[PDB]
């Protein structure tokens, strides 16, 4: 029974290890696209309120 448990633990280890491996790049791209959207909302709020500064001056 525990030999069966060993081979099952081996298959589950490899499976969810590949899963976490893919999730690594998943969260990596998630963080980077979050950073990109934050960065582009920034400097565009700046472009907007700067245009407003010029139109009020």
């Amino acid at each position: 029974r525990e030999r069966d448990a060993m081979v099952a633990k081996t298959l589950a280890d490899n499976k969810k290890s590949d899963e976490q491996f893919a999730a690594a790049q998943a969260d990596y791209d998630e963080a980077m696209t979050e950073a990109r959207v934050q960065a582009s909302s920034l400097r565009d709020n700046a472009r907007a309120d700067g245009r407003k500064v010029i139109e009020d001056a």
Partner: protein, 50 residues
């Protein structure tokens, strides 16, 4: 009493043939099973460290 002689001699020849045919192959098979299970547990350790 030479019946003991015949019986012991037969035992000797049959254990000789046993060491000729049976025990080599059965040891091979049990060692093959040992090799397989050892390889399986080694791959288990490999999966754990991975």
């Amino acid at each position: 009493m030479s019946t003991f002689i015949g019986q012991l001699f037969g035992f000797a020849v049959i254990v000789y043939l046993v060491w000729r045919f049976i025990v080599p192959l059965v040891g091979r098979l049990m060692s093959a099973r040992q090799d397989t299970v050892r390889q399986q547990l080694a791959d288990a350790a490999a999966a754990a460290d991975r």
